[PDB]
């Protein structure tokens, strides 16, 4: 494995639902590589239909710097218009993954709590969801890390 993820900091947390996601990513690259890394943030909604995922954003790194490297990935927020109203205040998942030359080799998942700003809203949620009052809390202390063996160069 030529690249390994060493660490993720979930920087702006808790955040508003519509705030971008700012993660500091630390990775190590052991040797020169021919192709790009692609880091990707995927929203995994609580909707039951198969389209419940959103690729939120992605960032390419290339040519890959050798050694230990630290950078910030700023990912666009979810498209609320693509999320059923009943699923905006809900427990959901975000996945940060990385691929090399299109081949995924690491994925980090987090559960995400989503609740209203104020008590009166939490106890009497309106039928029309007020997305501007929803606060997300990425449960950053409990990442689920999965690695996949891939061919590099």
């Amino acid at each position, epitope marked *: 494995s030529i690249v390994s993820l060493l660490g993720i900091k979930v920087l*702006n947390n808790p955040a*508003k639902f519509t*705030d*971008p996601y700012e993660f500091e990513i630390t990775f190590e690259c052991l040797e020169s590589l021919k192709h790009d890394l692609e880091w990707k943030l995927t929203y995994v909604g609580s909707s039951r239909s198969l389209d419940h995922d959103q690729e939120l954003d992605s960032i390419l790194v290339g040519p890959v710097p050798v050694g230990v*490297n630290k*950078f910030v990935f700023s990912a666009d927020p979810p498209s609320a218009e693509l999320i059923p109203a009943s699923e905006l205040v809900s427990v959901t998942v975000i996945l940060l993954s990385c691929s090399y030359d299109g081949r995924e080799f690491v994925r980090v998942g987090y559960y995400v709590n989503n609740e209203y700003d104020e008590e009166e809203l939490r106890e009497n949620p309106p039928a029309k969801v007020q997305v501007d009052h929803i606060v997300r809390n990425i449960l950053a202390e409990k990442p689920r890390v999965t690695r996949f063996n891939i061919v590099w160069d």
Partner: antibody
Amino acid sequence: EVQLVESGGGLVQPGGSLRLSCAASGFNVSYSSIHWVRQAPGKGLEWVAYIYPSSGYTSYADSVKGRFTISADTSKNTAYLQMNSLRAEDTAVYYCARSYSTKLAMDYWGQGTLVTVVS
Amino acid sequence: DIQMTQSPSSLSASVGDRVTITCRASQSVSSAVAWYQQKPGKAPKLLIYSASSLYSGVPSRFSGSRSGTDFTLTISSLQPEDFATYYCQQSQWYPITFGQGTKVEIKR
């Protein structure tokens, strides 16, 4: 209406300490990052440190890490830069700045406070 | 040790000129580049973020572009209030880094 009001500058002995503060108003610092950026006399901008008050995560420039500590009191909507073991080369105007939804660009800047390290 | 190499150090222009300022990142940056204006005795003001996004309230004659590691600020038609110093910034790689600045001065 967004304010970033700094305080704490002044003349200080080499090896001494100063605490700078940055009192924010018109936005919740919890959802932003707060940065310090300094400008030596007649020179350009040099990033110093940032904090995300929500998480407490911070970052420091190489030349100040271990000497400077950035912190935030969200209940007071205020950030702080504790500057220890000050050196001649720390003389500069120190700006407080806010980043929010701009991929760590700074969209609001305070007016700056001058730190002069002199014996 | 990422560098933002800003050129030129200064340039002279007239009102109405098209002005371009370039900042070359020493390694690839996807989008987190910003441009600032600073006038003597004043704090910097944000113009462009995310390489090409116009910050709210900034005049449309300001634009930003990315060409590989070249990041460019363009003022399509210089106005009198645009004589100032301009800084680029990258904020993808640790540490946040500014370019050395470009002073836009008045031709006579």
